Amino acid sequence: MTRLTVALSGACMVTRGGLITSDPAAERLRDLLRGTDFAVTNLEVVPSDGRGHPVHNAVGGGCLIADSAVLDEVTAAGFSVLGCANNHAMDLGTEGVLGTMDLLRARGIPYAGIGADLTGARRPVYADRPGGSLALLSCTATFLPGQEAADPSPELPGRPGLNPLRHTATMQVTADQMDVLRTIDAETGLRARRAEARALLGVDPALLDRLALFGTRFRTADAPGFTTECDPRDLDEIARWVGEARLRADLVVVSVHSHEPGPTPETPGEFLRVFAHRMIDEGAHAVVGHGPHFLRGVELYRNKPIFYSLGNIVSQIELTDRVSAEDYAKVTAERPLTPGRYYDRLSGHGTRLFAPHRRYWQSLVPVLTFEDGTLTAARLHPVDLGFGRPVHRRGRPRLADRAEAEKTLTDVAQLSQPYGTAIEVMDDGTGELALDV
Amino acid sequence: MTRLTVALSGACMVTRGGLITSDPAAERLRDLLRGTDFAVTNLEVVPSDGRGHPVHNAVGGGCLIADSAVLDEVTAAGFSVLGCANNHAMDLGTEGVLGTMDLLRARGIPYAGIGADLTGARRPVYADRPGGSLALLSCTATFLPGQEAADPSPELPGRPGLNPLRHTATMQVTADQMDVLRTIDAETGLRARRAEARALLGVDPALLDRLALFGTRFRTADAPGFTTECDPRDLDEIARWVGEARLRADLVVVSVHSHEPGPTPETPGEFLRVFAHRMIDEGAHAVVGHGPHFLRGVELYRNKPIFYSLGNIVSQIELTDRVSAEDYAKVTAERPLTPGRYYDRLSGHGTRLFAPHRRYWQSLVPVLTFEDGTLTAARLHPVDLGFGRPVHRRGRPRLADRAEAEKTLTDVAQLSQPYGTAIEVMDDGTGELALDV
Amino acid sequence: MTRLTVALSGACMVTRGGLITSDPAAERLRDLLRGTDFAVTNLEVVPSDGRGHPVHNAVGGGCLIADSAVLDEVTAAGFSVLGCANNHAMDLGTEGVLGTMDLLRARGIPYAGIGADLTGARRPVYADRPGGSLALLSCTATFLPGQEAADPSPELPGRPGLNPLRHTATMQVTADQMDVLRTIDAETGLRARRAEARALLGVDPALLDRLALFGTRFRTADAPGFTTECDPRDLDEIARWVGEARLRADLVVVSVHSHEPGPTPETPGEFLRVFAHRMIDEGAHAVVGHGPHFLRGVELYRNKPIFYSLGNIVSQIELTDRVSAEDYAKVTAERPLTPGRYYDRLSGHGTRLFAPHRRYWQSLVPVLTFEDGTLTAARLHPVDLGFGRPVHRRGRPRLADRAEAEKTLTDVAQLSQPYGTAIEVMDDGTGELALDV
Ligand SMILES: [Ca+2]
Ligand SMILES: [Ca+2]
Ligand SMILES: [Ca+2]
């Protein structure tokens, strides 16, 4: 009875206007987005009218701040529901995220992942349309510590921020390696410098055989290894809100931002896969991932899709018109630098970073078709971001032509093969997932 | 011709009123402070009327926020110049530090160490009195990353924050230990997870024989060791502002907040001693340190005093009326907790943390007498904070009685002995430094 | 692949509504402007809702302030990118230019040439359209000293203002004339009045054989002459921003406001020609000039056009409804004057100033067609401003009829002849530049 279509996309790092060019492929991408019931993208840029202060985010590539008019470029492109939890939503601080919320509400744009407190950032947003409703939840596993939102106490208010998916990594080492680490701790004098913390806490905070040194936790194992696990608090809370959202919407979509790689850059972290499985277990109809500037595999779990990374639907980092002083300080210069020259020198004039490689300039828009919560179709539309084009022209999305779409679909199928995912391929280069239903 | 007296003190963590009790010793402390030309303390608490949001500062003991009325308790006690750079000035964020600046300016209280940008936080404050002027500069080596203030760029404004004294620690390890660390990096799979960062940067960011892993830098040495060094940028900038301040004031006082211990908790970090020597080299008349909840040694360098830690002149952490939710979460509870019960359970009802030990409840107020920039006197006044008293009564300062003052002066002399500092002792328990001039 | 069209125009001094009349020629001008990708004009009037205070600008013809509704008359006419640097943007002071920026941003009108500081006034504005992007930079060589914008210092903010192109003029005189000037300096007693400036500076500021007297710099030469040179700071900075803008846009257009005449009123100043050559050397695709109330020549330099003066696309000075007191004081009167009567007496009731002469009421709209940065077409559309019409009807633009367009095109060709520019002429009176590409 209820038939709904949802368009998904990755990170949207838009800093300029004219997002949809006069190219018929870009206009067809816009027609595809406008033709669905819900089009979801994840705003990875702070829309600003001036409120806030730049935070030091050199580990995230610098501050990504743009004129608020870019919001109109998003909605006019066809997107209607925004996920806002990522490692850049706090680039202008708490004042910046409050201003972003104000801007989004003034334009009637439903959003999730950020709030005035932790609860508001964890809540789903309900987008209602004549055909039905979609609940969007947004979280991020990549962010600077302290940027997560906080709930109030009886005496103090909360803190504006993002919806966090924290995780801990543990280094498994052999007993001999462990004892060598303890010997390094003792002989260097590092242990001595915990003496006060010994007498105040009563015991060494490094001994919990487990160990904690250099801001990293080690554990004795038969063979060396590396494991990651989700924060139980965040996992349980996000799952609780997913279970809540299923009661109030036809479709529940969980968006997660995660740069964390697995054993190889193409594979997600183990904690992320556990998290996506948990989200589908609690009743989510789809899990859309992003973070990396490239595509990752697609997995069908309990007849629901998991897109571990859809890459970037928009990529205009080097075109931002506002570079902070701490970002400028990353490049030694004999004279003051303009933003474009700064970004040119930052990549060695295109010889480093994401420009020289092709996998960083392809993306994918999945269009999912559900009938009463059952996934009946999952079309895949490859997107070209303009690899090799000038910096001012690359990063704008368009439906890839047949050849490039076939190459992108091959990449996606290869990345999805370890999960047992199969893809039917159309003559135009688009495709769709093989379903069991 | 110009004769000036300056009273120094450590961290002032005031959260309640009635700072100066009806005890004649406390009133005599107030008379001592009011009797000098300048009385300097370092405000380690956010005075608030409601502006800002609590930041996660569990590593600093939680948020320390107090009613702005406590400012009147400081000035009425005799203090007239405030240093504000410490690990708690940003407990309410950038909005909180802006509100603190507004409150201090509305009450006519000169302050330094915080500003709307990095320059404003680095500037000295000039306190003018009929007898002459004092320039105060305030910085801190202990703070959460990102809390330092930032200067504007051509496109973006700065960021409100504190005046930073950053520093880096290096672990010297033998070549065999170094190779074991590299083997741990490789065999655990940690190196594999840098693969992307390898292809984007062109080289491994862990190889700079030096090494960088687990957020810590290691270097091959003949014998294991541990070294600390000041950030060259911060050292040079603070020295430049000290040289600037000498041109515009009779006396220049540099206040530094530093929890960092040396080989033993009583000794300062090597970087801190280098910093104090540099400050006196650039023309500072005194360097007053704080951070630890206990006293550290006193050193005479080029006939100028360096108080590495004056402890706390006020210590009312457990009496704060505003505990954040993230601070409450540090204590498991079967029911919601009130602030006092939270602090009681936080210390195991007085069996842990700073309460059981005496060195945490003594302090020192030095009164320095300069004549045309030459240190002619340096009286030491021991301060009792009420060890063993109830939690609501301990932490308020008073001039210690003869016995306790003698014990405190003995402690200070023992802590100062490695620097060659000698102290003459009065019959009342007070004393003064032996000078060469 | 990339094909873009840009419409250019001169100064837009609009003070009334109904800018596009019901005349089919005016509607065809509007259709021409709306039909291009970018239509650039230079707003020479302060749009005001009441913010600011009139500055004394009697040397610029008085204050030119208009109701902000005139902005809607500009955009509805077809213009989409505004240059704002001219000798009238500061007619309401710094508050006035801030209000103008607010008004332009509220209406979504891209602008350049003014900012809250010097950098913001020097930045290009990027207008994005489905077919591509255009970068506009705006500066002015005519303005009251002090009206240029200023950048902040570590202690003080900047100053809102215009983007300046300063220049210095030097009078070459023979050695005998030079010595006569020095003798006039000495014998009149003018040199004596520099005595204090002699003892404070250490040397006479008039002796730098060069000389500086009467606010003018003289230099000994074999034959008397007159030279002008650009300010090196402004030239280098504007060129730097042009080089920056080329990296981020398909087309870069530099708009310059300059009243300064050369040896004859029809010829530009030497500094202006050097500046335009420099702009094209740095990568500008076109240089559009304005300032004089008449047309100047067109020059093709390195296959890029330089329009030294496009005159006025709108000229409604005498129709302004707000005349300042200092402007009223320019006309002696027996009774208080209304604005229209003031402007009538100011021109001797049409017998003086710009009204009696025809070259002041013709203009030109060039439509340039670029293909991947290469100029492929440059159509010229003569514009009639209504010479001889009543004052309330003249100044509104319309496409000139065949006869008047032929006369205007002849004028433009004659003014362009010294630069080697040739023009093909259509049957309707319009034309296009002869290109080498
Ligand atoms: Ca990201
Ligand atoms: Ca502290
Ligand atoms: Ca003018």
Numbering used by the authors:
A (entry chain A), B (entry chain A), C (entry chain A): 1 to 208, 211 to 439
Reported in the publication:
The lasso peptide MS-271 is a ribosomally synthesized and post-translationally modified peptide (RiPP) consisting of 21 amino acids with D-tryptophan at the C-terminus, and is derived from the precursor peptide MslA. MslH, encoded in the MS-271 biosynthetic gene cluster (msl), catalyzes the epimerization at the Cα center of the MslA C-terminal Trp21, leading to epi-MslA. Herein, based on X-ray crystallographic studies in association with MslA core peptide analogues, we show that MslH is a metallo-dependent peptide epimerase with a calcineurin-like fold. The crystal structure analysis, followed by site-directed mutagenesis, docking simulation, and ICP-MS studies demonstrate that MslH employs acid/base chemistry to facilitate the reversible epimerization of the C-terminal Trp21 of MslA, by utilizing two pairs of His/Asp catalytic residues that are electrostatically tethered to a six-coordination motif with a Ca(II) ion via water molecules.
The in vitro experiment revealed that all variants lacked epimerase activity, indicating that the four residues are crucial for catalysis. In contrast, the loss of catalytic activity of the His295N and Asp11A variants could be due to a structural collapse of the metal-binding and substrate-binding sites, caused by a breakdown of the hydrogen bonding network between six-coordination motif and Asp11/His295 via the w2 water molecule and substrate. Therefore, we evaluated the His295N and Asp11A variants from a structural aspect. We obtained their crystal structures, MslH Asp11A:apo and MslH His295N:apo at 2.41 and 2.55 Å resolutions, respectively. Both crystal structures indicated that the variants retained the same six-coordination motif as that in the wild-type MslH crystal structure. The His295N substitution had no effect on the active center organization, while the Asp11A substitution led to the flexibility of His295 in the MslH Asp11A:apo crystal structure, where a 1:1 alternative state was observed for the His295 residue. The main chain carbonyl group of the Pro294 residue in the MslH Asp11A:apo crystal structure was inverted by 180 degrees, as compared with that of the wild type. Moreover, the comparison of the MslH His295N:apo structure with the MslH:MslA Trp21G complex structure showed that the distance between the Cα center of MslA Gly21 and Oδ of Asn295 atom is 4.5 Å, which is longer than that (3.4 Å) in the MslH:MslA Trp21G structure. These observations suggested that the Asp11 and His295 residues would play important roles in maintaining the appropriate catalytic state of MslH.
